[PDB]
Design a protein around this ligand. Structure first.
Ligand code: REF
Ligand code: GSH
Ligand code: GSH
Ligand code: CL
Ligand code: CL
Ligand code: NA
Ligand code: NA
Lengths: 216, 216
């Protein structure tokens, strides 16, 4: 079974977990806890990784790091990255537009100045969300009628910004519908209700936003 | 002919420019100068872009944004993204490892405390560069004998960190060699002496590091 290694947090790997659960792929999750930073440091250069980091993905055929390389590899092995340069580029464009939101959060979540930085991020967020709302006015999922890895990336981003402001999706009914649609996929619904789901933290435990042992 | 739209800076699109010149592709670059933000705002939503942003790339088949979608599309049109999931994932892993460096710079380059933040980045930089130095010990380019788009991404990142610290590659002879090897590619050599080459700025003009109209 492939091994997925990461901290016991959502962070960079949550979209990858959602994709694996949608595919019903068996995988072995190797998780590092809040106080296991030393265990990681003693294993980091002992795994055969060319660019040692978390997350990592090991399946015998490959030893990968970089969260986007890993999610794309899993999608690629299941023939989901797109059928021609045009479709593959549309999927990569969706990826990058989601990362603008998700890194917008992570960039400020460890700052002691978070409560002021959050205000600026939430003022810029609507312009980004509007582009996805428009994209979803004619399509069921981000790439049309079938699920692609960016849909799970967007789901993760929406989950995270709703912790920052539970009202930030009120002006975007298509995004509220999209989020409920992902949750209604049978594999996802079972996963999210199960003990396998990691609901918290969103970032590292030391983060000012999305850290700690429990949601506030 | 394809149109590439961006600010008249290196920024997010320099590796794409290098790739297009390496491939000897015909393209038109439409640049926005320091005082042309109004020009961009007047056409941002009139170009048919689904996720309007800079850079944009428009050809007869696609209207793209997101700098990484654009570079991947150009590579994909020339069959350079990788021959199997394993090779495509290694190229994506190299991408992400370069972006760790390049965004490490951009994250701090606009801060008025750049002089203090720089120190931490330059402290982390050697262990990031060491992974590339090791990769080039057994391969000519990052993916082997042939150039891939991550090679031009790495070139761009080395050019930028050398402005931050001229000595930061002194401990990495293979990276010093790699930078000169890219500059020796005849298409790149000619590009660097052409009217199209943008030598400065590295970031937006308003950046504390890599901004202004000329280098320090
Ligand atoms: O601040 C950022 O840090 C990053 C990284 O440190 C990185 O390794 C990759 C990325 C990336 O791919 O996309 C990004 C964005 O679209 C964005 O708006 C901000 C950031 C990043 C980013
Ligand atoms: N660009 C990399 C970033 C990886 C990263 O920053 N990982 C953090 C956790 S979110 C870490 O703890 N890395 C372990 C290390 O550097 O030793 C990716 O997307 O995978
Ligand atoms: N993740 C996006 C970031 C794009 C971005 O931030 N572009 C800046 C310049 S570096 C911009 O000026 N966008 C114009 C706008 O937002 O209207 C990418 O890689 O292309
Ligand atoms: Cl705590
Ligand atoms: Cl100036
Ligand atoms: Na706590
Ligand atoms: Na100046």
């Amino acid at each position: 079974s492939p091994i997925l290694g990461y901290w016991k947090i959502k962070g960079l790997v949550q979209p990858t977990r959602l994709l694996l659960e949608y595919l019903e792929e068996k995988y072995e999750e190797h998780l590092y806890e809040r106080d296991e930073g030393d265990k990681w440091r003693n294993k980091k250069f002992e795994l055969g990784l060319e660019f040692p980091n978390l997350p990592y993905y090991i399946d015998g055929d490959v030893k990968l790091t970089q969260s986007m390389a890993i999610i794309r590899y899993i999608a690629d092995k299941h023939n989901m990255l797109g059928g021609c340069p045009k479709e593959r580029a549309e999927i990569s464009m969706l990826e990058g537009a989601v990362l603008d939101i998700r890194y917008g959060v992570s960039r400020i979540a460890y700052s002691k100045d978070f409560e002021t930085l959050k205000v600026d991020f939430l003022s810029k967020l609507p312009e980004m969300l509007k582009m996805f709302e428009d994209r979803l006015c004619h399509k069921t999922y981000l790439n049309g009628d079938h699920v692609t890895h960016p849909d799970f990336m967007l789901y993760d981003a929406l989950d995270v910004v709703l912790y920052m402001d539970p009202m930030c999706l009120d002006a975007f009914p298509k995004l509220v519908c999209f989020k409920k649609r992902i949750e209604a996929i049978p594999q996802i619904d079972k996963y999210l209700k199960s003990s396998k789901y990691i609901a918290w933290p969103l970032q590292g435990w030391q983060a000012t936003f999305g850290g700690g042992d429990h949601p506030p």
